[PDB]
Amino acid sequence: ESADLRALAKHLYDSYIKSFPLTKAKARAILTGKTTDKSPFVIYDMNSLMMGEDEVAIRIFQGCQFRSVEAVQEITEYAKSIPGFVNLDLNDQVTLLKYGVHEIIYTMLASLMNKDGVLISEGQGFMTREFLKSLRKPFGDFMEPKFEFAVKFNALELDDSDLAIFIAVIILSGDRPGLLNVKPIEDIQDNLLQALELQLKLNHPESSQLFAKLLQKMTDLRQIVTEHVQLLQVIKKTETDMSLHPLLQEIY
Amino acid sequence: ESADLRALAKHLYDSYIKSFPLTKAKARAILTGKTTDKSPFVIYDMNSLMMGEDKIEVAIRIFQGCQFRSVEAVQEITEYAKSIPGFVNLDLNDQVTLLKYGVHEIIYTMLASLMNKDGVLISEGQGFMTREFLKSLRKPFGDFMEPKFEFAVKFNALELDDSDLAIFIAVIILSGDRPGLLNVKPIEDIQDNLLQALELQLKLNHPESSQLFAKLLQKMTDLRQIVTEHVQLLQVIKKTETDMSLHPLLQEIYK
Ligand SMILES: O=C(O)[C@@H](Oc1cccc(C(F)(F)F)c1)c1ccc(Cl)cc1
């Protein structure tokens, strides 16, 4: 009877694996687990940064939201793969992606983090956490709360099959402000929540109550997304430039 | 293994009954029509403040009352915590930061029971203050209760009764994702069990309400934001008015 739950599960797993080049399996088999393919370049301080492409803190935060925008296209193509999603009202598809993209970015940035730093480029760099903390004062405490979140989150040791379904759950919320038709949204989340329970039950047979521990991390995602959006304040009081980046501004 | 948690469910229900004099069941019989003796005196403007204070600045005297209700609630929350199995076997310092900010995440869960879309029970349930008398208040004060209402009406949609809430209240306390917690893991093995109790209890009490377990856990997000806002505006009310005094218990919970 619960066959579609196992089915939807690898439906989502397959889209996940198409939509996202760097899988968690791949990322962690490069970070901690001695990969071998070709150790990524490491950035530990101010001069290893200089000549990695081979001011500092501004262009590093910029670079981050450059990639955040690539990500959104990856996530948007995923959402559209979730059964029921495109059949929603089209405004609602947009409200769901608008309000849920940050949460998914920070869930998946966990996959590329360990306690000592984060994979850069796509697994071809690694920027140490200790270097990031030694950035200027607007930027020295931005990436820190995400590491703090990641180590907790990875302790759950989910893989990509788990994350595939979890990501779909975040999108199909039902409490985003400005939704015109919540029921098809909440009825889909229901089927997703149920496939995720199953998946966690059989892929993590003796990690009891992982479902519950995972749902309550959605609490800490939103605190993170909140404090992140609030940090975007510096933008107003920064070394705001002159005309050299117009188009780019509204690109972001 | 099943009646494990139903004996745990039972246990907590009892303490809850013993610890909190105004349950949801009682409050829901007052806010409706189950009354000839239980009907509240309704306050909605300021000469309902008036004669209202026979049947035992205004915006201030109300706020303090609300802040004093919270003290009572801290006291009863603490008594209920001690009954949660294993809770009292934890590091003295840990217990204190388990019942720190969690005291408010719970207060607003139980405030929801005294609320409908149009107001909140007051004084023993004797009273009932409307949402709009509150919103229509002064300086920052007219801001305070409104988001509790927003949460209260969407929370109350879940249709939880006391037996459900008892366990969920427990799960809130025994979290273990709180600043200062020396020895975490014993906390989240306790909580691990509560969630088992909650899971079984919800499926059994609300068999038709699928994924209520999931919907309910999610609401903890809304709770933290509610405390955030409350704490937040509870800094302004300290510059605008340096005359109001804050209760000793509320005093050091607030950091
Ligand atoms: O009537 C009450 O129970 C309290 O006054 C209140 C007045 C308005 C709102 C509230 C609250 F329940 F929303 F917090 C309490 C109250 C409690 C104790 C003393 Cl001493 C004074 C006022």
From Swiss-Prot, chain A:
Cross-link annotation Glycyl lysine isopeptide (Lys-Gly) (interchain with G-Cter in ubiquitin), location: K18
Post-translational modification: Phosphorylated in basal conditions and dephosphorylated when treated with the ligand. May be dephosphorylated by PPP5C.
Keyword Zinc part of the UniProt annotation: yes
Tissue: Highest expression in adipose tissue. Lower in skeletal muscle, spleen, heart and liver. Also detectable in placenta, lung and ovary.
Region (Interaction with FAM120B): 1-46
Motif 9aaTAD, residue numbers: 246-252
Annotated protein name in UniProt: Peroxisome proliferator-activated receptor gamma
Source species: Homo sapiens (Human)
Section covered of the full-length record: 235 to 501 of 505
